[PDB]
Amino acid sequence: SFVEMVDNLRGKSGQGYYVEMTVGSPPQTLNILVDTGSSNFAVGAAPHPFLHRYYQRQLSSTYRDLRKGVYVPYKWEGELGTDLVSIPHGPNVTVRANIAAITESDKFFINGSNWEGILGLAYAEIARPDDSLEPFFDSLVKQTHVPNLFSLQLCGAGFLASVGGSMIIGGIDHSLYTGSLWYTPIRREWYYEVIIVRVEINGQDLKMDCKEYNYDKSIVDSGTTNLRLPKKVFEAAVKSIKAASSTEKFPDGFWLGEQLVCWQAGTTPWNIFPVISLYLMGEVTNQSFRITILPQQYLRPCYKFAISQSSTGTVMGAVIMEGFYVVFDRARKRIGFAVSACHVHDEFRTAAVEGPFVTLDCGYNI
Numbered sequence: 001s002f003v004e005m006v007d008n009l010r011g012k013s014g015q016g017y018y019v020e021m022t023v024g025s026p027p028q029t030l031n032i033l034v035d036t037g038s039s040n041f042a043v044g045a046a047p048h049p050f051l052h053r054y055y056q057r058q059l060s061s062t063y064r065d066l067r068k069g070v071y072v073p074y075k076w077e078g079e080l081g082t083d084l085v086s087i088p089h090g091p092n093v094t095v096r097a098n099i100a101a102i103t104e105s106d107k108f109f110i111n112g113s114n115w116e117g118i119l120g121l122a123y124a125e126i127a128r129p130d131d132s133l134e135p136f137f138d139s140l141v142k143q144t145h146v147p148n149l150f151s152l153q154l155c156g157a158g159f160l161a162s163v164g165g166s167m168i169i170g171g172i173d174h175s176l177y178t179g180s181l182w183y184t185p186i187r188r189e190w191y192y193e194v195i196i197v198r199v200e201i202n203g204q205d206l207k208m209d210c211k212e213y214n215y216d217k218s219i220v221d222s223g224t225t226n227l228r229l230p231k232k233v234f235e236a237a238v239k240s241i242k243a244a245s246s247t248e249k250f251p252d253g254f255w256l257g258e259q260l261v262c263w264q265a266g267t268t269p270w271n272i273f274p275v276i277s278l279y280l281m282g283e284v285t286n287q288s289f290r291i292t293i294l295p296q297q298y299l300r301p302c303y304k305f306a307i308s309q310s311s312t313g314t315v316m317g318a319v320i321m322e323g324f325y326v327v328f329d330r331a332r333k334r335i336g337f338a339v340s341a342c343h344v345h346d347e348f349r350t351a352a353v354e355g356p357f358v359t360l361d362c363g364y365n366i
């Protein structure tokens, strides 16, 4: 039942959401980052200054060595193998999954994040060292009767700050959202790639060729904190946001996501910052639906501007997902969005999912 899966995610603001998992026999308990932006099950497997726990292969009676190393600059190095894996507050099953045992790394783990590994939930095409290394979720579906679908409700903090959420594996929990679920097609099965057809700041269209929004791609990534936008789109966005909040301005170190901005105890002028609407391509070619996010989402806790520039396409990260219940419907190659039961909002504005909006070529081919 999904009830036992509710609130199975925890984390620190800006450091990602993790789920408890066990690996090996007897079960070794570890906290694992839920990451829709990668496809490896990679776990710390050797002492590290930021790790308080790590996977000890020699303690597992069920560990099997694949006699194959892996080098991943992007960095971390490790040895490939397989072992039994379970999610205590997920489905009641045990699967034999590939595991990359990380023996050395640089700038990979985060101090105080309280996770020791990453659960890459994306597709095999982007798995390291290649696509023959079956990702965890693929193993899970193939080995069990679990439906090929999972959903994420990231809730952030609300009033480093602690965050919480739910990962529901194998179905949709209706208690986690209100209103309608709107679906955007998964363009290609590598990252969770989608297509943005329009974006507006306070109802004002940025008026860009929609290819700009997906240059060179747009992905949904729980493993990225910020909403990351292509250079040209980012500049247009900041300008519009700056203008809307012109009433008393801020340092540019803030707009660059460097410096923080501070008011005190519920004096934050949310109403000065505009809402941002991302229109996603619908299941019907000429249709779209918009997800609308509040300053409560893109200003993350004093606050930091959680929108930043990208040279690798648009990334709809945690701060975007935190407004919504997000359904990764792998079985039907689509991603669903609905207003989250947990999202933060004031008494004048709320996050929204609304459609359809019809138009009269937005993908950046590959």
Ligand SMILES: CN1C(=O)[C@@](c2ccc(OC(F)(F)F)cc2)(c2ccc(F)c(-c3cncnc3)c2)N=C1N
Binding pocket: 014, 015, 016, 017, 033, 035, 036, 037, 038, 039, 040, 072, 074, 108, 109, 110, 118, 120, 127, 128, 221, 222, 223, 224, 225
């Ligand atoms: C964008 N991104 C990362 O850089 C990564 C990552 C990079 C390379 C990987 O190994 C490969 F390449 F083999 F897949 C696997 C995953 C990542 C790595 C470490 C992190 F602390 C975070 C992170 C940091 N703060 C908040 N939340 C997540 C993200 N996860 C995502 N989505």
